[PDB]
Paper text:
β‐Glucosidases, major enzymes that release glucose from various natural compounds, are phylogenetically classified into glycoside hydrolase (GH) families. SGR_2426 showed the highest hydrolytic activity toward p‐nitrophenyl β‐glucopyranoside among p‐nitrophenyl sugars. This enzyme showed hydrolytic activity toward β‐1,2‐glucooligosaccharides specifically among β‐linked glucooligosaccharides.
To obtain a complex structure with a substrate, residues Glu168 and Glu318, which are candidates for an acid/base and a nucleophile involved in the catalytic reaction, were replaced with glutamine and glycine residues, respectively. Because soaking with usual concentrations of Sop2 (approximately 10–20 mM) did not yield sufficient electron density of Sop2, crystals of the E318G mutant prepared without Sop2 were soaked in a cryoprotected solution containing 500 mM Sop2. The overall structure of the complex is almost the same as that of the ligand‐free enzyme, although the space groups of the crystals were different between the ligand‐free and the complex structures. In chain B, the electron density of Sop2 was clearly observed and the Glc moiety at subsite −1 adopted a chair conformation (4 C 1). The six‐membered ring of the Glc moiety at subsite +1 is sandwiched between Met171 and Trp291 hydrophobically.
Numbering used by the authors: 10 to 410
Write the structure that this text describes.
Amino acid sequence: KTPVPFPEGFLWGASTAAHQIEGNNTDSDWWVKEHAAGTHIAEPSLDACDSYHRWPEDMDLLASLGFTDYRFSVEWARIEPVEGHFSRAQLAHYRRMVEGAIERGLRPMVTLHHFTVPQWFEARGGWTAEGAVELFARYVAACAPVISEGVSHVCTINEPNMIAVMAGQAKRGDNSFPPAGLPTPDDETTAAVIAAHHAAVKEVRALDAGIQVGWTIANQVYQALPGAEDVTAAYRHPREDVFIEAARGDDWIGVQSYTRTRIGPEGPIPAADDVERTLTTWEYYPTAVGEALRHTAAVVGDVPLIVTGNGIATADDSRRVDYYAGALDEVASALADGLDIRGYLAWSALDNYEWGTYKATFGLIAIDWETFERTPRDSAKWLGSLGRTRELPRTAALEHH
Ligand SMILES: OC[C@H]1O[C@@H](O[C@@H]2[C@@H](O)[C@H](O)[C@@H](CO)O[C@@H]2O)[C@H](O)[C@@H](O)[C@@H]1O
Ligand SMILES: OC[C@H]1O[C@@H](O[C@@H]2[C@@H](O)[C@H](O)[C@@H](CO)O[C@H]2O)[C@H](O)[C@@H](O)[C@@H]1O
Ligand SMILES: [Cl-]
Ligand SMILES: [Cl-]
């Protein structure tokens, strides 16, 4: 019904991840998987957006559009290309990104880990191997020159619940996803990423640089059909809630939401045949983030919430505007209800490599895969303008009360 001004210092921006935009990330586990014999990965990442060279243009564009914040990742595979050999070259590359954000009036949120790992880290047995926790923490300590000045927010591990899910697949040797919901996570990896996270928090806080640290959650918005509450709770806990519980002592927690999955007495039910879908196959559900935020609050307590990824894969930008109008309304609504939300970062700043395909275009900013030309979409112009306005618009539908 009425507009909700940004809280003071509210993050307003977009998010990317190194492997999805940078191009030539050739020391990652993913680079190997993309080219392995028998890979199921539909297409290779290759040059992606070449943000390795073109992040200056990325950030010029974001700032010009009126965004005030940029979440990007720094890449362990580059920083530690072989075990024990830290690249000062790549550390400086990443420090230049932080400084470059600041010089363009963008507050940088730094993700230290976004799914990919060094191939050597995978080859030695991944998150569940002996020493994996110490290895991650050492990498985190080594990022100190990148994050010790000018960075207010660090994300340790992006969506550890997706890590645990995929480890569950790899352990069973499963290649396909169920028609709804998520594969049983590997509880071993669950434990390992949680211990890795706490150790990373210690490392960042040890810098005594005031950094707010936490991690981000792939919120599924599991909804119980009436009667199926207990099944829904059991299903969601290892997939989501256990990672939110591990964040209860953190300085902030990231909410990443896109769609919803209904759960019946037998478990996850797929979207109806006739309901609107996005280019990811997911049900179009603009109000997801609303439920994601509220569920996250219920579980995590009073840890500040930030939306660190939210959007839609679509070829129709006016449908993206629709999606954000509903998502922003849910953010406003949660704020007005008194949730402590301190930022909104859209997924994604650019069209990017969506873990195996380039067809699932999530970008505010269009990318030509041949020339690397950036073209802001209209959604980008509108959302960006809110960085100056600093007020969340509402949809024209009525609230209760
Ligand atoms: O791969 C099957 C199953 O493994 C699960 O992990 C188990 C682990 O918790 C247990 O300690 C040991 C005991 O030998 O067995 C398994 O490794 C994992 O959580 C599931 O995702 C997998 O489906
Ligand atoms: O897919 C768009 C972006 O979203 C993230 O990962 C999502 C996750 O949020 C969601 O729960 C699952 C559904 O099974 O899909 C993943 O792709 C990542 O932050 C981004 O890398 C990803 O591109
Ligand atoms: Cl090196
Ligand atoms: Cl990384």
